[PDB]
Design a protein around this ligand. Structure first.
Ligand SMILES: NC(=O)c1ccc(O)cc1
Length: 173
């Protein structure tokens, strides 16, 4: 890897005492920062074909999917709102696979609070906005649940510049 120190976050905007945000690609952030923990936007079967999960898995050259398939065959699926800790491969020491509700598929948005409570077992995390994208939840709402629920230090990477700008505007109202 590059020779930088681990957990080297740069250029984030501090929103609260423990929540930070950056307009960035989470894969490029993982490579630059070398965090202890990267959060995956997982589904219950740990099938990483799409969304953030697909980007993370591709950046591990499919090692994340191989490990996840081995895990599920023995250990069974996660629950919505739940998490597991598997290897971070080349991206991080650990990957916290967190299942936000998929409101495009009828799941209860209330489970987003449970989803973010998984972050509180880790002192500092690189993460995407939970339940965004293929999961269908309103990103402004997801940021509010994050701020209200996470107590540990979270560094959120949002790649779409227009969505970033709307999140920051929303939060500063
Ligand atoms: N990026 C990494 O692989 C890493 C290694 C050791 C740590 O204590 C934290 C992170």
């Amino acid at each position: 890897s590059n020779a930088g120190e681990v957990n080297s976050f740069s250029g984030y905007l501090k929103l609260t005492d423990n929540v930070y945000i950056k307009n960035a690609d989470i894969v490029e952030e993982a490579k630059k920062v070398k965090p202890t923990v990267v959060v995956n936007a997982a589904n219950v079967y740990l099938k990483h074909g799409g969304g953030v999960a697909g980007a993370l898995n591709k950046a591990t050259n499919n090692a994340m999917q191989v490990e996840s398939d081995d895990y599920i065959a023995t250990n069974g699926p996660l629950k919505v709102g739940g998490s597991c800790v598997l290897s971070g491969h080349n991206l991080a020491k650990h990957c916290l696979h967190v299942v936000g509700p998929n409101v495009n598929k009828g799941e209860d948005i209330q489970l987003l609070k449970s989803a973010y409570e998984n972050f509180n077992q880790h002192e500092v995390l690189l993460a995407p906005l939970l339940s965004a994208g293929i999961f269908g939840a309103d990103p402004i709402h997801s940021l509010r649940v994050c701020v209200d629920t996470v107590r540990t230090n979270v560094y959120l990477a949002v790649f779409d510049k227009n969505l970033y700008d709307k999140l920051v505007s929303s939060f500063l109202e």
